[PDB]
Write a protein of this length. Structure first.
Lengths: 62, 99, 31
């Protein structure tokens, strides 16, 4: 189990806050330069917007 | 403990819409959902291995992407696996608007 | 920081960790 979650970090650079209600998407996104908080209310958004938005945090430059 | 690991996996699966499966013949299958907003559960997948030279190798892509060989060359050259995965998802998004 | 080790790991090593340690399951199909 650990190895897959480690790779999701390698891919997304996101670390979740595991102590919050399920309705709250909360965590931190890391990068070269300073780390950025995420705190969204899942009830306000579609599943696809949540995924598109979170993926837009991930840089596409090679 | 182990509960926290399974929880982390499910949070990434649901929030990124990305599942990772270890399948036969030394391969991992990456399955993206939440690509087509009109059909959020529809999967877009590719499979990957590390080949005998220790290189990334995409061994299949369903549906096919015409840029994924270019992406394989780039990830080999840069070792930037994050960007490789991000660019494949962008490419499935785009493909979903083609026709 | 705490991710120091993951940030510098080679993704090929990480991918091989999953492939060697997780049991195989069926691939999902378009169907």
């Amino acid at each position: 189990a650990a190895y897959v979650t480690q790779l999701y970090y390698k891919i997304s650079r996101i670390d979740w806050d595991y102590e919050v209600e399920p309705a709250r998407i909360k965590g931190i996104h890391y990068g070269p330069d300073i780390a950025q908080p995420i705190n969204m209310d899942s009830s306000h958004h579609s599943r696809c917007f949540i995924s598109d938005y979170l993926w837009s945090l991930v840089p596409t430059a090679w | 403990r182990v509960e926290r690991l399974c929880k982390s996996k499910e949070l990434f699966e649901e929030r990124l819409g990305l599942e990772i499966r270890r399948i036969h013949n030394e391969q991992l299958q990456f399955i993206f959902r939440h690509i087509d907003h009109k059909d959020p559960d529809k999967p877009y997948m590719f499979t990957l291995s590390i080949n005998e030279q220790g290189d990334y190798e995409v061994t299949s892509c369903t549906p096919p992407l015409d840029c994924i060989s270019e992406f394989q060359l780039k990830v080999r050259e840069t070792n930037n696996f994050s960007a490789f995965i991000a660019n494949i998802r962008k490419a499935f998004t785009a493909l979903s608007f083609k026709q | 920081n705490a991710f120091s080790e993951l940030d510098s790991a080679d993704p090929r090593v990480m991918l091989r960790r999953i492939i060697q340690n997780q049991p195989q399951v069926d691939p999902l199909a378009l169907q």
